[PDB]
Design a protein around this ligand. Sequence first.
Ligand SMILES: CCOC(=O)c1ccc(OCCC2CCN(c3ccc(C)nn3)CC2)cc1
Ligand SMILES: CCOC(=O)c1ccc(OCCC2CCN(c3ccc(C)nn3)CC2)cc1
Ligand SMILES: *C(=O)CCCCCCCCCCCCC
Ligand SMILES: *C(=O)CCCCCCCCCCCCC
Ligand SMILES: *C(=O)CCCCCCCCCCCCC
Lengths: 54, 279, 279, 4, 4, 4, 62, 62, 62, 235, 59, 59, 266
Amino acid sequence: QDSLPDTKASGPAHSKEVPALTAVETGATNPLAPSDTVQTRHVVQRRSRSESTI
Amino acid sequence: QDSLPDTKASGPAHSKEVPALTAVETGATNPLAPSDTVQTRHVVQRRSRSESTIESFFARGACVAIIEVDNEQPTTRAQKLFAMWRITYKDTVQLRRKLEFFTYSRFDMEFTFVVTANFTNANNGHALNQVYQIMYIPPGAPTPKSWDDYTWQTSSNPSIFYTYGAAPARISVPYVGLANAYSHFYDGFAKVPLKTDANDQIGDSLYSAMTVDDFGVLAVRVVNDHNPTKVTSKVRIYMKPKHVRVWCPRPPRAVPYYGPGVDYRNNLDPLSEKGLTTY
Amino acid sequence: QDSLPDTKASGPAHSKEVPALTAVETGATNPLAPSDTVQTRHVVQRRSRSESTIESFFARGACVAIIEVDNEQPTTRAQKLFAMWRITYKDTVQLRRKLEFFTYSRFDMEFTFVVTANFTNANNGHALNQVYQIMYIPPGAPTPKSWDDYTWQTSSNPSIFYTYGAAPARISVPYVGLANAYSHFYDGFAKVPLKTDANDQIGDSLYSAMTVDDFGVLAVRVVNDHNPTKVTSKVRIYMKPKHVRVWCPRPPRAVPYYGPGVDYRNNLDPLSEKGLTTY
Amino acid sequence: ISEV
Amino acid sequence: ISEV
Amino acid sequence: ISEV
Amino acid sequence: GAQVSSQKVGAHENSSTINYTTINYYKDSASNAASKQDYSQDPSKFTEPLKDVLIKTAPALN
Amino acid sequence: GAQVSSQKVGAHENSSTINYTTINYYKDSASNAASKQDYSQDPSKFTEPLKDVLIKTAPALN
Amino acid sequence: GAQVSSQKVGAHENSSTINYTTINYYKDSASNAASKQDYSQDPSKFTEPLKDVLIKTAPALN
Amino acid sequence: GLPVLNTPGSNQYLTSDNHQSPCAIPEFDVTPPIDIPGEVKNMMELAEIDTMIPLNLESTKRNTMDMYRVTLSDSADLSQPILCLSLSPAFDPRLSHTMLGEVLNYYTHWAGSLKFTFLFCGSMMATGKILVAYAPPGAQPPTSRKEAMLGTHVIWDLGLQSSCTMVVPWISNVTYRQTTQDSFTEGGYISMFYQTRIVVPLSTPKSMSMLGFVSACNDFSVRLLRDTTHISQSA
Amino acid sequence: GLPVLNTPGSNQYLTSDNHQSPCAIPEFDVTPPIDIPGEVKNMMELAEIDTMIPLNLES
Amino acid sequence: GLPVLNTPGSNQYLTSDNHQSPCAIPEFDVTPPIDIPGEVKNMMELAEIDTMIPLNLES
Amino acid sequence: ACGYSDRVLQLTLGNSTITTQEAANSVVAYGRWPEFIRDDEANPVDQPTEPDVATCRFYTLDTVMWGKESKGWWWKLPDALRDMGLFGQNMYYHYLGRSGYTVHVQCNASKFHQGALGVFAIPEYCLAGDSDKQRYTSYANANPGERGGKFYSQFNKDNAVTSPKREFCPVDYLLGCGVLLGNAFVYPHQIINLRTNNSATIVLPYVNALAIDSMVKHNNWGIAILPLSPLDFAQDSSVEIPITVTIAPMCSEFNGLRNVTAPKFQ
Ligand SMILES: CCOC(=O)c1ccc(OCCC2CCN(c3ccc(C)nn3)CC2)cc1
Ligand SMILES: CCOC(=O)c1ccc(OCCC2CCN(c3ccc(C)nn3)CC2)cc1
Ligand SMILES: *C(=O)CCCCCCCCCCCCC
Ligand SMILES: *C(=O)CCCCCCCCCCCCC
Ligand SMILES: *C(=O)CCCCCCCCCCCCC
């Protein structure tokens, strides 16, 4: 099996966790996903990156 | 075992069961058999529907294109030193009609290329054997302007190098659709005109058409440098669907095709004259 | 083991058993052997009838047709740019006579195609290698009017694409009969004249003939566009029955064939003159 | 192998 | 295989 | 043989 | 990795189950020939799309 | 799915049962070569179609 | 020495794991075709080369 | 180098073949199937679905909506046939273009039982009894109810059950008939007559339409795929 | 690509040969055999049946 | 000599194919791999790395 | 038991109820009842909107009159419903929307009237056009909304090259699409035969090559109503009865919310 990560059913938010905020100065890229900034449904992912292998 | 249902020995009737009567208004077809309306014997059936499977029905290489390409001295005007063909089953009518018995289809595609060539002019000496280059250019990739320009370097596009006289070229292509099935018919548009638009051309589109370049093109050229004498050639493309699945049945085309959509123009009179009480 | 019955050491006789006497009126053949009419030794027989099996007897590719086809400039008159041949074993006499040793037959058929070509005219330059298209047109399917018309698109008809110089083309065909066996002879008609008929042509038919198109035709063309100089070609068709079964034995044809039925015309004198008491 |  |  |  | 199956014998030679062998040479399944052992199904979704599917001997409209 | 059988050896080299191997490549049995191991039968249906088949040593007509 | 593996079937014919067979004919491995069963890895060395890699929900700079 | 010997047929291209070949786009990530409604596995499924027969192809009636409408009336000549038709499912004009006839024109041979269902589209106050028949081939095609009576037949009585099905039973000499016309493999005759007559009351239309439908029974099969005469193309 | 070497006889057509070849009509539903009377398995069966000799071939 | 039959596609060259072929330099002593930092296994790794957008393409 | 029938139905959806005392059973198109997009067939990742009873209810379209000259009527879905209460709003405020439907077609008359309506539900109902021009029918003319369209008895070509009508020309016996009407029965259908039934009830699943699509760019189903047998009554040559189409969305779900789409129907 080589499919990509499934999408999670994510809900409403009121917290002190702020993933939408970051600091690119550090050299890193924010590891975010739709479920961090918007309400998502559960999608079972079948797509794979087989053609883009080296 | 794949044979059809045996016939039952059925006898005389005097009952309140009336299978001969029905009501087609309901939308259904009466599931009747000879044994419901007549006395039948017992027949052991050996006949099977093996040739009419969706696979067997399409399992044949159909001609969908003739690409004409020449090899001659590159002069300074419109010539055919290379050719391009938008991949499609619609330039031809025969396979088009079979696939159109259905709304949706999903299959792998086999392409077989029959190359033929000949001498144009009575005589300027002859030609050594020609090698042909068929390059698939997927939408987005650079289209050749010249028969020997850089796009033919083909670093990532699939290319076939065919040698004249050899067994016809053959390749397979996976199910490459942007959707879960190829749509043989699309009751829609690719763009919608909005009230807020500046001109009314912005949101204008061809009815029933989806993507502009849909699957891309096949570019053909003779890799050989020109001989003194000219050689004209034809790449015949045969298409065969394999590992086939089909959905939602449609009536067969009854009048001659008029372009890519369902449009008709003429010969709208498909049926013959025959008398009501004539056999 | 498939050898024939051994010979028995048989001795002198003085008995009331008279095997030498019989009565052919009964319809039967006397099942005699040397040991019934003469003193024999014991011979262990190794000989076998392996070459005379129904399969071995037919197991050979026989020429049943020569289809002549040209590739030349399409002019405006009767030409051979494409040809058609009603499939049959009856255009030739040799295989026809072997299959006719029997009334009924059931087999699979192998077809091998020997293509040969040549230059017609002393010299108009030359020709690049020709590719041939053999299309089977089953009864009902559209017959070509033109060498490059739409029927050659061949979406559902079986077609062979042969390249000159390559090993002869070959294909197999299943038992395709409308009945449980191919009839080599049909003592009947396809239509019957009824008293109530308007003209007496309505119910008229060819004696011993069954279906009009019986198995269909093979259409042949050169897929190549015409060279300046003309190339004439011949497709020789070899037929071989395999997985063969035969019924009801018939006497061999003793006089020259006169058409598809059993009709004779001339050379009705098959036997030589030889004296009654001459060795 | 795989025999059906 | 199948040996006769 | 070697079956993965 | 050889695949073995029974041919459906039509015209039988005077000699019973006869088999044929198949092997895939390519990684991409699109490259494969057609197996042609195709199963069938009911006409029903098309010949009787009814919510109350009724028995052929009883009145169609009751 | 390979088929193996004994050849009927005619001229024996100075070296016993020798075999040959056969494999069918095609699904359609019509595509197959000829097995040529053909069994035989009696002439009887043709040489003696009689309702009372009699013994060769007894009078044909009794 | 035959190598057997599962194809990833895309468009399924109306007939399940389908396999393909591979055999190397040459001693030098450079002569071999490409296996194309390629494993992947994390973007991390590139997307987060950090000495203290932090959790996406906590402040990037604390 | 394995010693091999090339046989006849080597390097030909047969349209009908079944072989492997190199994949032009290696490792392509194929879009998965979704469960779409309406899937077909065999073309005979479509020939089993009832479709309207163009039963009336008279001069002004053909290639118009009236070709599907057979007129019945309380004053029709009772001696005469309502309709007559030949059992040639792919060739006879009335049948050739139905879904049944249309699949059969892609095949050289057919076999099996057929069925004809007739719809009375008259007003509810209209009554009637009709004889519909099938005569297996070989005799005079029926010109009178008296002759039609003698063969396979259904006596339809018009009432709450609007429609009547006549099964044409597979009765044939050959194991498969042909899809084109041919006396050797001919199927016979279909004909219809009033058994009594259409009776209406007053203030009721005295004339109405009958619709006819055809489909194949489950014993029906077809063979030898071929190209149809029902579609073509000009240069 | 399996390394092969073509031998003599490659690409000839011998009338007497026994080989497989592609089926031109795939999946054709073949009509079954019925038990017909009079079947022959070997041509010598016919030569074993008595037939009338043209013993007198005078002018 | 094994009886074989050549199919369509025989002797073509497809840019996209995957086949074996003779090694031009037999038994060459190949230099071993060393563990180099920065290895990539899939091109989508690079598209996942943040890069600066030319957001202002005015004249 | 009690006295139930194939001809007496009650359809209840949301705050709407339909009763019929003379139906002909009911068709479930291709044997599939409408359903929601499953997680393993899902494609847009954003949480969908499911308005349930506020959008999945019976909208009655403007009535058409069947008369002796009537050649046929046609509607497209979702187009017919683009302005139907909260359904239309959900349809235009979201990029993506799927829907199943219950189609209920109404035509009553009397034991003395006569005629037969062919009610057809067609997947991807592509119609033919006006002109010499191929695939030239404009979005505005392709989509009549509630008003629907009509069939014609013959192909009268839109002749004026200068200012083209860019309309459809649907010829009845060619189903307006190049095939013959007698074969339209391979599609999900019912017949309103006036001596048998007042109505037809076809239930429709979402049919498409995608799990979900743009409802504004694309119609999934087409409703074609062609008189198989003409309207006739007593001897009055200008008879006329109403045909009323009532449609309900089913299992409607929406994805990709943003500002409202305002199409130009001018
Ligand atoms: C929307 C209607 O059209 C179709 O359904 C339909 C039409 C054409 C189809 O073919 C697949 C598209 C292409 C994709 C790749 N392709 C190739 C690829 C490589 C080579 C050498 N030659 N051809 C050629 C065909 C598949 C489906
Ligand atoms: C009634 C007397 O004739 C026969 O018995 C008899 C005569 C001919 C026979 O051949 C079988 C019929 C056809 C069927 C198909 N066919 C084909 C099919 C495909 C191709 C490429 N080429 N030929 C050619 C032969 C079989 C039997
Ligand atoms: C399973 O297939 C194991 C048995 C293999 C037998 C030998 C096959 C020889 C041909 C190998 C084909 C390799 C194709 C890439
Ligand atoms: C039974 O046949 C299993 C053994 C197979 C041995 C390898 C055969 C290699 C050739 C396979 C032929 C495939 C033909 C379509
Ligand atoms: C492992 O491979 C053992 C099984 C071999 C089966 C027969 C293969 C026939 C082809 C051999 C190829 C030799 C190549 C140099």
